[PDB]
Ligand binder design. Structure first.
Ligand SMILES: CC(=O)N[C@H]1[C@H](O[C@H]2[C@H](O[C@H](C)C(=O)O)[C@@H](NC(C)=O)[C@@H]3OC[C@H]2O3)O[C@H](CO)[C@@H](O[C@@H]2O[C@H](CO)[C@@H](O[C@@H]3O[C@H](CO)[C@@H](O)[C@H](O)[C@H]3NC(C)=O)[C@H](O[C@H](C)C(=O)O)[C@H]2NC(C)=O)[C@@H]1O
Length: 77
């Protein structure tokens, strides 16, 4: 399973909004993974698991077309 991260936010509404928008441009599960980092809560907007490298590439393209951020491969935490 391959995962992308599209943004990471201190504001939870910003993370939830990005999650909602991403659900309109991919069929992969979109979720928020929140962690403590640098004494703050960081809400990381991720999607996956994606079943193939080619689908990752096309999903990255769709996210860029939608102007939603810079979709980056991540290892799930
Ligand atoms: C793809 C991704 O997740 N990018 C985020 C980025 O990630 C790093 C990361 O490096 C490692 C993990 C590390 O830092 O240890 C790595 N990516 C991954 C996935 O691992 C890669 O190398 C560098 C970079 O990419 O982290 C930064 C924080 O350091 C995230 O930055 C956030 O960017 C968003 C989008 O620009 C900010 O939101 C915007 O804020 C402006 C005002 O500043 C508003 O006017 C905009 O409306 C708002 N956009 C949206 C869509 O809401 C975001 O700041 C806001 C204020 C927030 O935190 O709520 C900013 N977050 C932080 C914590 O700085 C980047 O998303």
């Amino acid at each position: 399973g391959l995962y992308l991260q599209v943004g990471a936010f201190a504001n939870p509404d910003a993370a939830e909004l990005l999650k909602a928008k991403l659900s309109g441009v991919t069929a992969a599960p979109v979720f928020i993974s929140s962690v403590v980092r640098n004494q703050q809560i960081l809400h990381r907007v991720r999607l996956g698991p994606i079943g193939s490298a080619d689908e990752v590439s096309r999903t990255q393209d769709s996210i860029r077309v939608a102007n939603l951020g810079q979709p980056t491969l991540v290892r799930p935490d």
